[PDB]
Design an enzyme around this catalytic site. Structure first.
Site, mmCIF file in Angstrom:
data_model
loop_
_atom_site.group_PDB
_atom_site.id
_atom_site.type_symbol
_atom_site.label_atom_id
_atom_site.label_comp_id
_atom_site.label_asym_id
_atom_site.label_seq_id
_atom_site.Cartn_x
_atom_site.Cartn_y
_atom_site.Cartn_z
ATOM 1 N N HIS B 7 0.827 -1.202 0.000
ATOM 2 C CA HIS B 7 0.000 0.000 0.000
ATOM 3 C C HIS B 7 0.863 1.254 0.000
ATOM 4 O O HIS B 7 0.516 2.256 -0.636
ATOM 5 C CB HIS B 7 -0.941 -0.011 1.203
ATOM 6 C CG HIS B 7 -1.858 -1.195 1.243
ATOM 7 N ND1 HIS B 7 -2.920 -1.343 0.376
ATOM 8 C CD2 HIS B 7 -1.875 -2.284 2.048
ATOM 9 C CE1 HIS B 7 -3.552 -2.472 0.645
ATOM 10 N NE2 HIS B 7 -2.938 -3.062 1.656
ATOM 11 N N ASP B 13 3.498 5.962 -5.476
ATOM 12 C CA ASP B 13 3.450 6.154 -6.918
ATOM 13 C C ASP B 13 2.628 7.399 -7.223
ATOM 14 O O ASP B 13 1.400 7.329 -7.329
ATOM 15 C CB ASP B 13 2.855 4.922 -7.604
ATOM 16 C CG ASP B 13 3.062 4.925 -9.109
ATOM 17 O OD1 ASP B 13 3.116 6.017 -9.713
ATOM 18 O OD2 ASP B 13 3.168 3.828 -9.695
ATOM 19 N N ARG B 16 0.446 7.437 -10.470
ATOM 20 C CA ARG B 16 -0.747 6.604 -10.351
ATOM 21 C C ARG B 16 -1.782 7.244 -9.435
ATOM 22 O O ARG B 16 -2.953 7.382 -9.806
ATOM 23 C CB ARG B 16 -0.370 5.217 -9.830
ATOM 24 C CG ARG B 16 -1.549 4.264 -9.754
ATOM 25 C CD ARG B 16 -1.617 3.540 -8.420
ATOM 26 N NE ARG B 16 -2.053 4.425 -7.344
ATOM 27 C CZ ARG B 16 -2.598 4.006 -6.207
ATOM 28 N NH1 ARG B 16 -2.783 2.710 -5.995
ATOM 29 N NH2 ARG B 16 -2.966 4.884 -5.284
ATOM 30 N N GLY B 40 -11.766 -3.511 -3.565
ATOM 31 C CA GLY B 40 -10.398 -3.571 -3.091
ATOM 32 C C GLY B 40 -9.900 -2.222 -2.616
ATOM 33 O O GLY B 40 -8.876 -1.723 -3.093
ATOM 34 N N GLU B 62 -13.082 -4.450 1.208
ATOM 35 C CA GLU B 62 -11.691 -4.881 1.242
ATOM 36 C C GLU B 62 -11.610 -6.234 1.933
ATOM 37 O O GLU B 62 -12.212 -6.427 2.992
ATOM 38 C CB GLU B 62 -10.811 -3.853 1.962
ATOM 39 C CG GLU B 62 -9.398 -4.329 2.227
ATOM 40 C CD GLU B 62 -8.655 -4.706 0.959
ATOM 41 O OE1 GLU B 62 -8.755 -3.963 -0.040
ATOM 42 O OE2 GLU B 62 -7.973 -5.752 0.964
ATOM 43 N N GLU B 91 -17.326 -10.608 -3.720
ATOM 44 C CA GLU B 91 -18.236 -11.590 -4.299
ATOM 45 C C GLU B 91 -19.284 -12.069 -3.301
ATOM 46 O O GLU B 91 -20.363 -12.512 -3.712
ATOM 47 C CB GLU B 91 -17.450 -12.784 -4.849
ATOM 48 C CG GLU B 91 -16.599 -12.481 -6.080
ATOM 49 C CD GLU B 91 -15.199 -11.997 -5.737
ATOM 50 O OE1 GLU B 91 -14.906 -11.817 -4.536
ATOM 51 O OE2 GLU B 91 -14.387 -11.802 -6.668
ATOM 52 N N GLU B 105 -8.652 0.105 -7.928
ATOM 53 C CA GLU B 105 -7.258 0.024 -8.354
ATOM 54 C C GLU B 105 -6.942 -1.460 -8.488
ATOM 55 O O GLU B 105 -6.636 -2.131 -7.499
ATOM 56 C CB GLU B 105 -6.339 0.715 -7.354
ATOM 57 C CG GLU B 105 -5.285 1.598 -7.989
ATOM 58 C CD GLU B 105 -4.317 0.828 -8.862
ATOM 59 O OE1 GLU B 105 -4.046 -0.358 -8.576
ATOM 60 O OE2 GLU B 105 -3.825 1.418 -9.844
ATOM 61 N N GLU B 114 -1.043 -10.205 -11.154
ATOM 62 C CA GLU B 114 -1.740 -10.325 -9.877
ATOM 63 C C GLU B 114 -2.853 -9.278 -9.797
ATOM 64 O O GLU B 114 -2.909 -8.439 -8.898
ATOM 65 C CB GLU B 114 -0.763 -10.208 -8.713
ATOM 66 C CG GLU B 114 0.303 -11.301 -8.671
ATOM 67 C CD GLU B 114 -0.248 -12.681 -8.333
ATOM 68 O OE1 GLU B 114 -1.181 -13.154 -9.018
ATOM 69 O OE2 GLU B 114 0.261 -13.301 -7.375
ATOM 70 N N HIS B 263 5.140 2.426 -10.994
ATOM 71 C CA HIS B 263 5.706 1.223 -10.395
ATOM 72 C C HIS B 263 5.468 -0.014 -11.253
ATOM 73 O O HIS B 263 6.155 -1.024 -11.061
ATOM 74 C CB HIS B 263 5.130 1.006 -8.995
ATOM 75 C CG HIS B 263 3.754 0.421 -8.993
ATOM 76 N ND1 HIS B 263 2.631 1.157 -9.302
ATOM 77 C CD2 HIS B 263 3.320 -0.833 -8.723
ATOM 78 C CE1 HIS B 263 1.564 0.383 -9.221
ATOM 79 N NE2 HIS B 263 1.955 -0.830 -8.872
HETATM 80 N N1 LIG Z 1 -3.189 -5.595 -6.819
HETATM 81 C C1 LIG Z 1 -3.829 -4.512 -7.228
HETATM 82 N N2 LIG Z 1 -3.858 -4.209 -8.511
HETATM 83 N N3 LIG Z 1 -4.430 -3.729 -6.343
HETATM 84 C C2 LIG Z 1 -4.446 -3.955 -4.904
HETATM 85 C C3 LIG Z 1 -5.380 -5.080 -4.499
HETATM 86 C C4 LIG Z 1 -6.192 -4.671 -3.289
HETATM 87 O O1 LIG Z 1 -7.556 -5.102 -3.503
HETATM 88 C C5 LIG Z 1 -7.917 -6.072 -2.536
HETATM 89 N N4 LIG Z 1 -8.698 -7.115 -3.193
HETATM 90 C C6 LIG Z 1 -8.281 -7.966 -4.182
HETATM 91 N N5 LIG Z 1 -9.199 -8.808 -4.590
HETATM 92 C C7 LIG Z 1 -10.305 -8.487 -3.809
HETATM 93 C C8 LIG Z 1 -11.607 -9.017 -3.751
HETATM 94 N N6 LIG Z 1 -12.038 -10.025 -4.512
HETATM 95 N N7 LIG Z 1 -12.466 -8.468 -2.863
HETATM 96 C C9 LIG Z 1 -12.039 -7.463 -2.093
HETATM 97 N N8 LIG Z 1 -10.836 -6.884 -2.058
HETATM 98 C C10 LIG Z 1 -10.008 -7.446 -2.946
HETATM 99 C C11 LIG Z 1 -6.614 -6.559 -1.904
HETATM 100 O O2 LIG Z 1 -6.836 -7.001 -0.570
HETATM 101 C C12 LIG Z 1 -5.775 -5.283 -1.955
HETATM 102 O O3 LIG Z 1 -6.081 -4.402 -0.880
#
Ligand SMILES: NC(=[NH2+])NCC[C@H]1O[C@@H](n2cnc3c(N)ncnc32)[C@H](O)[C@@H]1O
Ligand SMILES: NC(=[NH2+])NCC[C@H]1O[C@@H](n2cnc3c(N)ncnc32)[C@H](O)[C@@H]1O
Lengths: 322, 319
Positions: B7, B13, B16, B40, B62, B91, B105, B114, B263
């Site tokens: 984070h 960044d 971004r 997220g 989150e 979900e 994001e 990822e 980044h």
């Molecule tokens: N990796 C990224 N491009 N962005 C950051 C991912 C952020 O979204 C959150 N996140 C990822 N998938 C999910 C999901 N299905 N539901 C909620 N939060 C999510 C994760 O915990 C992190 O805080």
């Protein structure tokens, strides 16, 4: 491990380390009287650049023993310099290699992070016992460990970052600082990072010395290497932990140092962070003991057991791994 | 993501974070009095941008333990009345209403490594009102042939050893080229405009409002491309990067080497050996971004290319 040193990147990093490579070049060439017409064993020769330095210093015969696949590049480098008659790249571990003779000198670049992480000191000591003549030369001959309390300015930057978000984006995130401190300091890992003189909070203390010629240094690596220290803080600053670095001494005395007060190398320093920052003031007494140990899971992985006391606070301990 | 470093890296960044801030704030007219879903939310900084833009409510979902920090951040900003942090995956989370807008994001390295695009698509289907706002709303994938100047210095280092220490090591350049280019891995490194060999080509576009986009990610995303080289240089491979487009009221967040660095940097697809090219040398081919068969979260890239009169070759990259 065999896969790492068979790749270009680690050798490119070691040779581009100008402070390290120039120190070995000079430490070898300074010993021309002890090497002229003699035989050398290079433990972990890599590309064979140290073996060539020994031949330029006047060595009659150099055996470049290298275990990884890079020995085939070392052979090419040695023929490229017209030195295959004097420098013999021998593949395989130094423990099973067959030399035709005991040698007059041993040279090796064996140090890892924190001196003893993924290190080949035992391989060098194994070669000293099996192949070094009585009264032979060791290059380097000794290694000295150092410790100093630090106030890592980069860590302070990452900790205060959350108190700085509101100035830039308008969102107050100072409540993250307590959470960021636990994530960046509560772990039990050794952090490899290069510090500057501004980070050093007290006079660096030399807490251990390893003489590579001593028999029994092998057994003491298993028991642990280190010692005790005491220092007084320069002034008022948050104590984040300790920086551990090393130096190696060539018989001249040339010193190759990895100290933050001296030009940087690729080893940087090994940072041992406390769980939380500790306020200290001028003349605050910090004492303790540090032990460099092999990890019980992996004997190549460095473990550092810290025991410290800050002023009148009760003595604490912390157990680090690389 | 329960750790602080990722984070901290995202918010540090500046390109971004400032782009997301402006894409949200410039949509004040569309967000005023409306509801927003933050997929997220992490620390919740984007949900607070949406509040300042005029949103009447923001649901910050989150899944990691960082939701407790976002809960504190919203309270510290006196915004728990209109910004509500809800733990768990998007979900299974239960919202009291469908929302007018989604902000997220979600992009990873190579756009789809990822990434959480599927979660955002899951939330679009379940919670976004008809025609609702998506921030960002689309992603554009770009490719350009490159002559990596950093790679050439890493190759040329071995010919420079004799000048300093007097040991010739030029025989290593052949060995360093095989090690740094013969692999089949996606290299995340940042380039400059000096590295770009031809005009960047857009080979794919993803529209986030499209239902059935999730099934198309699993089959593969990409397309064809054609370009002519600027001039003479060694061709080392191809750089893939992305940009996200916000609906205007049109702000673009780019990860191109010709634009300020992020980044994400760029995804470098190295050929096995350098290939000499000259001015007007035509390079054509196709690129497909796929989920890895071992790991559906891991980015795989199928590259198919043709340089001038040479035979069409292929290479299979993974992260
Ligand atoms: N990796 C990224 N491009 N962005 C950051 C991912 C952020 O979204 C959150 N996140 C990822 N998938 C999910 C999901 N299905 N539901 C909620 N939060 C999510 C994760 O915990 C992190 O805080
Ligand atoms: N200086 C360091 N921290 N590491 C140097 C490791 C280098 O020595 C080589 N090496 C490590 N152990 C051995 C050994 N027992 N015998 C020979 N070469 C070795 C390894 O292949 C690499 O080239």
């Amino acid at each position: 491990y065999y896969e790492c040193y068979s790749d270009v990147s680690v050798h490119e990093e070691m040779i581009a380390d100008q402070v390290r490579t120039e120190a070995y070049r000079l430490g070898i060439l300074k010993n021309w009287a002890a090497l002229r017409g003699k035989t050398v064993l290079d433990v972990g020769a890599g590309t064979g650049i140290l073996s060539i330095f020994c031949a330029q210093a006047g060595a009659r015969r150099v055996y470049a023993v290298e275990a990884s696949a890079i020995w085939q590049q070392a052979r090419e480098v040695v023929r490229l310099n017209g030195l295959e008659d004097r420098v013999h790249v021998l593949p395989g571990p130094v423990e099973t290699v067959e030399l035709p003779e005991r040698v007059d000198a041993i040279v090796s670049e064996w140090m890892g992070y924190g001196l003893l992480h993924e290190s080949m000191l035992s391989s060098v000591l194994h070669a000293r016992t099996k192949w070094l003549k009585e009264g032979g030369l060791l290059l380097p001959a000794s290694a000295e460990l150092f410790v100093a309390p630090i106030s890592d300015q980069m860590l302070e930057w990452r900790l205060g970052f959350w108190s700085q978000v509101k100035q830039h984006y308008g969102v107050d995130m100072s409540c993250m600082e307590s959470f960021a401190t636990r994530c960046l300091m509560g772990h039990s890992e050794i952090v490899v990072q290069d510090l500057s003189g501004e980070d050093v909070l007290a006079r660096p203390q030399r807490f251990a010395q390893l003489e590579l010629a001593r028999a029994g240094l092998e057994q003491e690596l298993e028991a642990g290497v280190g010692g005790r220290f005491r220092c007084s803080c320069y002034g008022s600053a948050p104590l984040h932990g300790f920086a551990v670095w090393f130096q190696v001494t060539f018989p001249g005395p040339l010193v190759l140092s990895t100290s933050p007060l001296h030009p940087a190398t690729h080893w940087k320093q090994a940072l041992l962070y406390l769980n939380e920052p500790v306020p200290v003031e001028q003349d605050t007494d910090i004492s303790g003991e540090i032990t460099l140990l092999p990890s019980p899971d992996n004997p190549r992985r460095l473990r550092i057991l810290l025991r410290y006391k800050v002023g009148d606070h009760e003595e604490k301990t912390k157990d680090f791994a690389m």
